[PDB]
């Protein structure tokens, strides 16, 4: 196993952990604030997916500070992971193209 495929795999498992912990921590911080809709785990898990994937949507979002900090973590972990996979596809393509040129 290379590096760009170990990291791509590791980032996926790390992202799932961010999605799950983000769902749990979102409900923890959103409950107590009036009007908050991010207060059940199943839909928070759906929100964390919307959030990590940056679809966002708008049916769910945090209204508390610590809920919005949890958001920031979920977004960055999502953008970085899906970007680390792209960077891994480039190394795979740049690599196999060197083999197509002999070198």
């Amino acid at each position: 196993s290379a590096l760009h495929w170990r990291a791509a795999g590791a980032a996926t498992v790390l992202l799932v952990i961010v999605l799950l912990a983000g769902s749990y921590l979102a409900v923890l911080a959103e409950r107590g604030a009036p009007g908050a809709q991010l207060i059940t785990y199943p839909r928070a898990l759906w929100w964390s997916v919307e959030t990590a994937t940056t679809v966002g949507x708008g049916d769910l979002y945090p209204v508390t500070l610590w809920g919005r900090l949890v958001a920031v973590v979920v977004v960055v972990a999502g953008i970085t992971s899906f970007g680390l996979v792209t960077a891994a596809l480039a190394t795979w393509f740049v690599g196999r193209e060197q083999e197509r040129r002999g070198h």
Partner: antibody, heavy 118, light 108 residues
Framework: QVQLQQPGAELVKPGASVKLSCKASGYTFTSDWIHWVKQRPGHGLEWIGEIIPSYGRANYNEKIQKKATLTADKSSSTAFMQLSSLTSEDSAVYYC???????????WGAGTTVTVSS | DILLTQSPAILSVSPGERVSFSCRASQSIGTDIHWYQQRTNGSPRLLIKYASESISGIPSRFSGSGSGTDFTLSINSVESEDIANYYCQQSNRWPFTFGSGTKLEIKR
């Protein structure tokens, strides 16, 4: 088996305090929220607050004069509601309910009749 | 906060006849409504969750309907055991709020 177990009754002198219990059994997850509901005789159900025992954070009904303080001993699977400075207005039945973090109260306790009298 | 209005508060119906309770939320709450039954001196018991999803142990004559703001709990063929108070409860926005309650009354 009985999941949420509450005492029968408590007699509280006016202005005194009382610590109601709610021992749990059955599947206890980390997503368990324990709620407390107040029902005056003849009246409806009134949400008081919620507690997450796997962390210890408690939220309370913003619309009422806060008369409760929710705790939880994670080792004994027991949620406690500490009422204090009670009047006859606080004399009612107090249920505890278990929420699986998904909105509904899956199970309730038998409730504890709290009588504030001399 | 979301207000759960239950009108009428009392509902008369003949035995074996179909009944329907009404729960209205002050704003749209999707399907995040739940129904509870409370007989005399008994604890509330969950009848219907998420407007229409049923519970095991609750008879099949208990059904639910509605979305957004208008929700309905219906009983096909009312029985004497159905005599109780019926509350609705929303979990769309915090805090959770209850309905005022509707008393079922059989005319035998």
């Amino acid at each position: 088996q009985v999941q949420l177990q509450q005492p029968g009754a408590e007699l509280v002198k006016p202005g005194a305090s009382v610590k109601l219990s709610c021992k749990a059994s059955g599947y206890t997850f980390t997503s368990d929220w324990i709620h407390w509901v107040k029902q005056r005789p003849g009246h409806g159900l009134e949400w008081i607050g919620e507690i997450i025992p796997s962390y210890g954070r408690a939220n309370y009904n913003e619309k009422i004069q806060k008369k409760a303080t929710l705790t939880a001993d994670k080792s004994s699977s027991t949620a406690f509601m500490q009422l204090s400075s009670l009047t006859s207005e606080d004399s009612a039945v107090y249920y505890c309910a278990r929420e699986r973090g998904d909105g509904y109260f899956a199970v309730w306790g038998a409730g504890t009749t709290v009588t504030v009298s001399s | 906060d979301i207000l759960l209005t239950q009108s009428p508060a009392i509902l008369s119906v003949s035995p074996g006849e179909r009944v329907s309770f009404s729960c209205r939320a002050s704003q749209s709450i999707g399907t995040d409504i739940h129904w509870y039954q409370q007989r005399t001196n008994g604890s509330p018991r969950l009848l219907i969750k998420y407007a229409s999803e049923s519970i095991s142990g609750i008879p099949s004559r208990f059904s639910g309907s509605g979305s957004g703001t208008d929700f309905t709990l219906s009983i096909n063929s009312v029985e004497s055991e159905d005599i109780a108070n019926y509350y609705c409860q929303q979990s769309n926005r915090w805090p959770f709020t209850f309905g005022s309650g509707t008393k079922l009354e059989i005319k035998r």
